[PDB]
Subunit: 411 residues, 2 copies
């Protein structure tokens, strides 16, 4: 079948693709990420990721939990700095139940304060777990430096707001962003007019990422240095941004082979020529509706990172000068064509690509057309892309034992 | 009497001033602050501030504690990023006891590991107490930005080194910096050759320091607090330079805190300049830090969350106008009278005097009498004070804050 798609006069979107799968899948995306938080109501969105499965006007927290598990369904939340996502899974004989539970969470939650207060310390858990993975320190402390207010906001609540988030801020945040204009309802293995029936019946309701640059240095006790160095980018959808996406793979954005030596990654090889001590490196490419970021992510030892980062910085530098050949670029295209299609292979990874476009575009982009956009990329744009990285103002962030780590200006 | 002074061939210094006070006072200063810590052995000096009153080869931790208290003496430690200080108080009939305890702490401590491990969590206390006073966040997070390695080091141990400081690092830090070349023994109400007798007998003993390379930058510690604490500074002149005295004058011209209780700081150009714009509770004052290698100068800020962006610009402009040339002699003459007072009032006590004696002694080959210091104040020209302000405006900046920064600017917006 083909992906249905439309829009409501209230600005709401619907899609549908009856894949004939046994298990349906429905996902309500939205533009209510963490960038929409001011300095006052921080940690709000982290509470909302957990505020699902709470009391509603349509049902209680107990009915929701068991009513889902009785049919063996699923309920999961995903967030980005821009977008949020409420998603379900179930069998297509059980769609109508999960919707009634889904919308009561989204549309009309009550957020009774005691349930909220019992939920606050869960933040300390979900945060500190995900910060075991050291990248989450770096990336969060990185966006705090590159950008000022909006996209610099953390997905994860800071420590001082714990037990201070009110229901008042939530309902405000609900009413201020959970609007039909910002939403995009999506369903797979499901018919189109059903979601029309649901949305018309129920969902029919009512800052800038200013770049600054800078640097963070989180000295900690750990033998490995985690570090990143980036510059301002192009927003998603620009052909300019596709050039970075190509440039990302030219440098090598992680191994394709298990335990491979990353033979084609110009960075990992360029570092290997200088360094002979365990390391890792890869291309970082973040994109957003207003802006994005590009550069590379670093892992090294405490007494060798100062060599690794310079080598990566020079490899990008040579490519900006003009040192780049077509087949190298053609290879990165074949990678990018693969990275996209392999992402949307599953129902889930597909589902993220559908509504992201739907919120960021007035229509779904078929993947075949995306492949055409890849081929449209010129090698010179990829070079001018690298020029921006070198010439543009930088943003930096690290964590570890920084006894030998340089700064921006030394690079 | 007059302040005795000399130096030993091993590079050790002694002074003495028999003030005929009932209570003696002795202080062993040294160049072993926090700048001498690398990234590996951080928190070391914070442990040493507490590692006093531990076991030694000369005595046990119990003997030291009670033997002092039995005579009602005192033992206190002071540290700076450059210097440390071990000081005592006692009655002059009880000098020889406190010395034997003092030197055994300094000269030959054992640092037996279990006592050390029982002492580690005390760091979490002494730190977090002093960080109740919000300035300590700002100032520490400030030096981390202005400077790279040496003076950027915190006096206070970071959280990850807790329970990881070894005795090995200490004895190394002892042997690497507790040398006779870096010390300066001082005693008041005490005779000179006594300290000569002690030092020659005991202190006659044997890592280099690092540079305070300036970088600039900014820190922004978003927290839940209605008040914004903030600072903005630039690179300075080291202590002893006549250049540095100009800042010290410029410090008082702007107003480095009230002289009157609850006064409106009538002469503080900053507090008045802010007052012309703002009509909501605030505070501001001149910040002037100086060090042997470098220093810092600027101003410290306190404002509300939704008004600091106006306060800092007003202070920035008041300094800016003065750099352009807007400055008169009697305004400058007033700040001199302040500075002449701030110095003399500091060295009024035996204690505040004692810090001024040995600081010079470590940073100079001889004591500077205060009368000569007053001459150096009068030597300052108004134009140097203006060129001083030019450096603040023209030089690269360093910034730091803490609070609700919803409306707070950056360096570049200033």
């Amino acid at each position: 079948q083909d992906l249905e798609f439309t829009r409501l006069p209230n600005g709401l979107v619907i899609a549908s693709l009856e894949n004939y799968a046994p298990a349906s899948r429905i996902g309500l995306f939205i533009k209510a990420g963490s960038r929409y938080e001011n300095s006052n109501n921080l940690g709000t969105s982290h509470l909302l990721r957990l505020a699902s499965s709470l009391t509603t006007k349509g049902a209680s927290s107990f009915k929701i939990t068991r009513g889902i598990e009785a049919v063996g369904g699923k309920l999961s939340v995903t967030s980005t700095r821009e977008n949020m996502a409420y998603t379900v899974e179930c069998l297509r004989d059980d769609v109508d139940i999960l919707m009634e539970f889904l919308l009561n969470v989204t549309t009309a939650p009550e957020f009774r304060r005691w349930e909220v207060a019992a939920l606050q310390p869960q933040l300390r858990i979900d945060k500190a777990v995900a910060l075991q993975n050291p990248q989450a320190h770096v990336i969060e402390n990185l966006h705090a430096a590159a950008y000022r207010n909006a996209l610099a906001n953390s997905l994860y609540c800071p420590d001082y707001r714990i037990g201070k988030v009110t229901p008042v801020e939530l309902h405000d945040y609900v009413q201020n962003h959970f609007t039909s204009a910002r939403m995009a309802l999506i369903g797979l293995g499901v018919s189109h007019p059903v979601l029309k029936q649901v949305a018309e019946q129920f969902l029919n309701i009512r800052a800038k990422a200013k770049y600054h640059g800078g640097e963070i240095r989180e000295q900690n006790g750990d033998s490995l240095v985690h570090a990143a160095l980036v510059a301002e980018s192009a927003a998603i959808g620009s052909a300019e941004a596709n050039a970075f996406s190509v440039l990302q793979h030219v440098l090598g954005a992680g191994p394709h082979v298990k335990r491979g030596s990353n033979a084609t990654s110009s960075l990992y090889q360029a570092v290997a020529k200088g360094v002979h001590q365990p390391f890792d490196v890869s291309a970082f490419n973040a994109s957003y509706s207003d802006s994005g970021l590009f550069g590379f992510y670093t892992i090294s030892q405490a007494a060798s990172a100062g060599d690794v980062i310079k080598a990566a910085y020079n490899q990008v530098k040579t490519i900006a000068q003009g040192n780049l050949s077509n087949p190298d670029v053609q290879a990165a295209k074949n990678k990018l064509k693969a990275g996209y299609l392999m992402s949307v292979e599953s129902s889930e990874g597909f589902l993220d690509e559908v509504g992201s476009q739907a919120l960021a575009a007035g229509s779904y982009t078929p993947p075949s057309t995306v492949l055409q956009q890849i081929d449209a990329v010129a090698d010179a744009d990829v070079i001018n892309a690298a020029k921006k990285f070198v010439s543009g103002r930088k943003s930096m962030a690290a964590s570890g034992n920084l006894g030998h780590t340089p700064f921006i200006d030394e690079l």
